[model samples]
Target: EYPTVSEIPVGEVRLYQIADGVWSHIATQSFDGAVYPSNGLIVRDGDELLLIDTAWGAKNTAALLAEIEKQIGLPVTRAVSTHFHDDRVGGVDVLRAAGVATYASPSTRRLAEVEGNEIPTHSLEGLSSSGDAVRFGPVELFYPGAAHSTDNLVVYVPSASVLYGGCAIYELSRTSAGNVADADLAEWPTSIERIQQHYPEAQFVIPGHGLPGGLDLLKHTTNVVKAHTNR
Candidate 1:
C-alpha cells in the first residue's frame, strides 16, 4: 500500500513521501513572481537513492541533492529522465558533476543534444517504435510509447505499488492534458492503456506537475484525453 510520510518543504524544493521507500520532490520555478511546481521521484534502497528526474535547473538540482543527502545521508547514485523538458532534466550537468549515472531514451538524448545540452550517460533505444522496460534492481522504467512528450516514460516501484507517471499521465485534479505541443493525441490512450495493463496493482501515482493519487489517476488521465479527443 502507498502511504505518505509528511509534506517536507525545503525552500523552493518541496518533498513528500509517497510510499514506504519512495519520495516525490516538487520543485518550484519562478517566472514573473509566479511559482510553478514540477514533480520528480526518489526511490531508496537502503543507503542508496535513485532519482527519477532532476530539478528545474542546476541550482535547484543542487538544492535537491542537498536535501536528499540531508535526509537519507546517502548519495543519489543513479537518475533517469522521463523526458527532455527542462523540468525533467534541466540539471543534467549537476547530476553528471555529482557522478550520478544518468539514463534516458534515445529520443530524449537526441533532443537534448540538439538543444546543445549533453545529458544521460545511458540511452535506451527502440522506444519510439516499441515499448521497452528497464530494471535496475527493484526499480523499473517502462516506455509505453509517446503521450505528453516524444520520449516520456513512467517509473514503477513494485515493492510500494507506486507508479511515477511523470508528464505522461495527469493527476486526479487535472481535467485536461497540459502540453500537447510535443504529444501524440492519437496515441495517448494507447500509451496510457499500456501503463494501466502493466501496473494494475499500483495504489499510488505521482504525475509530473500535480499531487499524487491512486490508480484512478491513470484512468482519469485516459478519460481526460478521451474527452479532449471528442472535442
Candidate 2:
C-alpha cells in the first residue's frame, strides 16, 4: 500500500496493514473511557484481497487504503469484515468507493439494515458471512465461527501459513474476560480450538488488534476471554 496517494487498478486486489501500526484492548466505550490501539489485517492475491476488519472509522480506513495502494499496487477487490465492531468493520463506504466488495456474516448484514440493533452495524453490501473461503490465486477465506463477536471471522492464507484473527484474538496475555457484551465467550475457545484443529499447519497468527504471533495467539485469546467473562 502507498503512503499517501497512488493510481488504483479497476479490479485488481490491494491489501492494507492498519492497526498493527497501533495497539488495543477491545476499544474504549463511553462507559469504559479507556482508549487503546487496534488493528485490521489485509491480504491481496490477484483480484481478491481480504480485509480482516475495517478499523475504527472512515478516516482511519482512508489512511489504511493509502497504505494498501502503496504496498499492493492495485485496487481492493474484496474486503472480509471480521465482525460488526467499529474498529474491525467501520469503513464499508470507503471500500465500496474504490470498488472493494465488503463481505460479512448474514447476521451482520441484517444487523446493518438497522443502525440500532442489539449489536452494532454499519453500511453493508455483498455479504459473505457463511465463514467460507472465496478463493483468489493462492489464499482462501475460512470463517472460524464467532469468538470476539457473533459476526467475527478468521481468514486463512494456506500458501503463506498466514491466518488472520479479526477482532476475535489479540496479543495481550489471553485471559477469559474482556468485551463480554460483544464477545461470544461461550464458544470462543472451542472455535479457536477448531481453527487450530482445522488449520494445524498455520505458521502465522495475525490478530486484528495485536502483534502477529503463532499458535500461542490462540492461547492468548482464550486467556483474554477468561479475564473478562463471569465464569
Candidate 3:
C-alpha cells in the first residue's frame, strides 16, 4: 500500500498522502489571531473516501473535501471523528450537509451533546459500552481508553500499518499533554501504553497535531503524559 507521498494545500487545510489511499489532513487554525495546525486522517478505498476527522469549520472542511474529491476523483462516503472536541468534529455539519454519513464513539457523541455541537449521524455501537475494536470498510477503529479526550478513538489502516493516534499521542515537538480540560489525566499514560501494545508495528503514527512519525511518538506521548500526571 505504499504510494509516493502526495501533498496539496487546500485553503487552510493541507493534505498529505500517507499511503495509496490514506492521507493526513492537516488544517491551519487561528484563535485570538494566533495560528496553529491540527491533523486528521483520510482513507480512500477505491472511489470511496472515509474521513477520520474534519477541520475546525465549514470553510476549511469544504476546502478539504473539494481538494480530496478533486485529487481522488471521488466523493467522501463517510466520516468518523476520533474525539468530541471541535478540532476533531467541528466540520460534522458540513459533512452531513454534503450527504456524507458521519460517525463517532458513543462517548464522543455524548460529549458533543453536552457541548451542544453537531452529533454524528451514527455512533460506534459495541464500543459504546465497553469494547476496543470496530470495523468499517478497510479501516479499524480502536479505543485504547481515554487520554487526550474522554473518548479518543484511534484509526488503524492495517494494510498501510498506519495509526492515526488523533489526540491520544503527540509528535516529539511538544512535550506536554495538551488540553486536558476533558481528558482522563490519571489514565492517559496507560491508554498510550495500550496503544503501543495494540499496534506494535505501526510505522506511520499521525497525532492530532504536528508531524507523523513511528512508534517512537507513542513512547514519547506516554513519557509526556506521565510527566504531566507526576507534576
Candidate 4:
C-alpha cells in the first residue's frame, strides 16, 4: 500500500510514497463546484529530488514547495512536465524562481507559449523524442506519441518499476475520456500500446488524477479510449 508522507491543507496537496524513493504528489482543485485532483511525482535522486509536474497554480505550487522542504527537507533540483497543460506546467515559473532547473519537451514549451501558460526553462529537444528515452537522474522520460495531448510524455523509473502516465493514461474512475480538446483519439490507444511494449516490467502505474494501480490501469485506459472512440 502507498504510504502518506505529508498532507498540506493550504496547498490542497498530499504526498504519497509508492516506492522506496518515489512519491506521488496529488493536488486538488475545484471546478464548476466539483473537485478535481491532479497528480505529479517526486523522485529522490541521490541527495536531491526530481519533481514531475506541479500543483494547480502559482500559489498552490508555492505551498507545495514549502511543504516539501519542511517535510522531506530535500531540495528539488530539477523538474519536468509531461505536457504543456496548466496542470502540468503551472508551477514552472515558481520552480524557476526557486532556482530549480525545469525541463519540458520543445513541443510542450511551444504550446505553453502559444496557449499563454507558464513555460519551462530547458528544452528536451535534442535529448529525446517520441519512442526514445532520456535519462534524467534515475528517471527515464519517454514520448509515446500523441495521446492525451499532442506533446504528452511519460516517465519510467526502472529502479522501482513504476510508470508515471500523467494525463495520457486514464484513471479507472473515469467513465469516458475526461478532456479531449487536445487529445488524439486515434493515437491514444497506440500510445498506450507503446508504453506497454516499452515497459513490461512496470508494476505500479500512476495516472494523472486518481489512485495508482497496476498494469490494469493501462488496459483500462485503452478500453476507455476505445469506448469513447467507438473502436
TM-score of each: 0.89, 0.72, 0.92, 0.94
**Candidate 1, 102-184: lDDT as tens digits:** 98888899887777665788876646663677786568888888788778888999999989998887877779667788788
The Cα local distance difference test for each model comes to 0.81, 0.58, 0.82, 0.87
Give a tens-digit lDDT track for model 4, residues 1-231.
442223434455677888899998877776787767788999999999999998878887897898788878999999998999999999888999999999998899999999999999898864345587788888999989889998999999889999999999877888788889999999998889989999999999999888788888999999999999984
Error of 1 at 39 (Å): 1.0
Residue pairs clashing in model 3 are none
Please give the TM-score that candidate 2 achieves against the real structure. Answer: 0.72
Q: Candidate 1: TM-score? A: 0.89
lDDT of 3 at 6: 31
Candidate 4 C-alpha error for residue 163, in Å? 0.4
- Residue range 1-231, candidate 3, lDDT tens digits: 221113323345667888888888887776775566778888887778898898877888898888787777688989999888888888899999999999987788999999998788897876653238878888988888878887888989999999999888887887877788988988878888888887898889998888778999988988888898888
Return model 4's CA RMSD, one decimal: 2.3
Model 3, runs deviating above 4 Å: 1-11, 129-131
For candidate 2, lDDT tens digit of each residue in 1-231?
Answer: 321112322222233343332111122112254334455555555555555566466666676677666765566676666666666556677777777767666666665555442232333333244334555344555566667776666667765677777667676543435565766777888878877776778777766654567888887777767656655
Of 3 and 4, the candidate ranking higher by lDDT: 4
Tell me the alpha-carbon RMSD of every candidate.
Answer: 3.1, 7.6, 3.3, 2.3
